[PDB]
Design a binder for these strands. Sequence first.
RNA 1: AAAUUGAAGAGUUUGAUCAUGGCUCAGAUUGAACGCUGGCGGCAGGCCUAACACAUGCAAGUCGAACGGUAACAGGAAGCAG
Length: 158
Amino acid sequence: ELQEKLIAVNRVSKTVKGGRIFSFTALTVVGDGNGRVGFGYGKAREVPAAIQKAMEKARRNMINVALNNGTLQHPVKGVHTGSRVFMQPASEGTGIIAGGAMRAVLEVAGVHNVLAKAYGSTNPINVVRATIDGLENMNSPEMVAAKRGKSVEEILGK
RNA sequence: AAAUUGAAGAGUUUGAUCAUGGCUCAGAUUGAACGCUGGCGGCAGGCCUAACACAUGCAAGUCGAACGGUAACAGGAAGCAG
Ligand SMILES: [K+]
Ligand SMILES: [K+]
Ligand SMILES: [K+]
Ligand SMILES: [K+]
Ligand SMILES: [K+]
Ligand SMILES: [Mg+2]
Ligand SMILES: [Mg+2]
Ligand SMILES: [Mg+2]
């Protein structure tokens, strides 16, 4: 039911009196392929434990995205820390034209066609955060009409 | 009718981190050259350097329906003779 993807595993270190203690971090995303997506970040002495923790957090941190037939509603910009991302809808058959970190998020969320670009820092943790922020801030015609007190036809008419 | 269907990142500074920042790579292209190799065909392309110097052959003639003419050769006309 839920598609899970491991985006990056990194080895970090802290120094103690006897020397360096290594550990691992895992960044993952989960999604239902129908507008729900979440990301998890886990730390452990071992890679499988870190990955399991990340999946556990991702399953709990899901948000909702208003998709339009497997594409975005409109161009969106997202930002987190040094990472800036830009995404726009594309015609059917275009595919996911995006870098790896954005691609995992978009694919588990269920975006099938999109043109994307990452500016600034391409650190995967912050790129994932910026991508999810843009998707969560995307608007749909229903929301726009409701908030403006108009009808969907008046929003998208002549 | 149709003739703007369009946008990917990665490595490297630290014990580790986030940022900044340069360097490096994956693409496409060429009047190309070199190394190894090499079956056929079609279409195109071929001194980018010395606007350096050039053997030899050819790259601008034609008109006798403008004209005086006859160097040929081809007849016509006169004579002679194997
Ligand atoms: K590391
Ligand atoms: K180095
Ligand atoms: K860099
Ligand atoms: K330094
Ligand atoms: K330090
Ligand atoms: Mg080192
Ligand atoms: Mg020349
Ligand atoms: Mg000639």
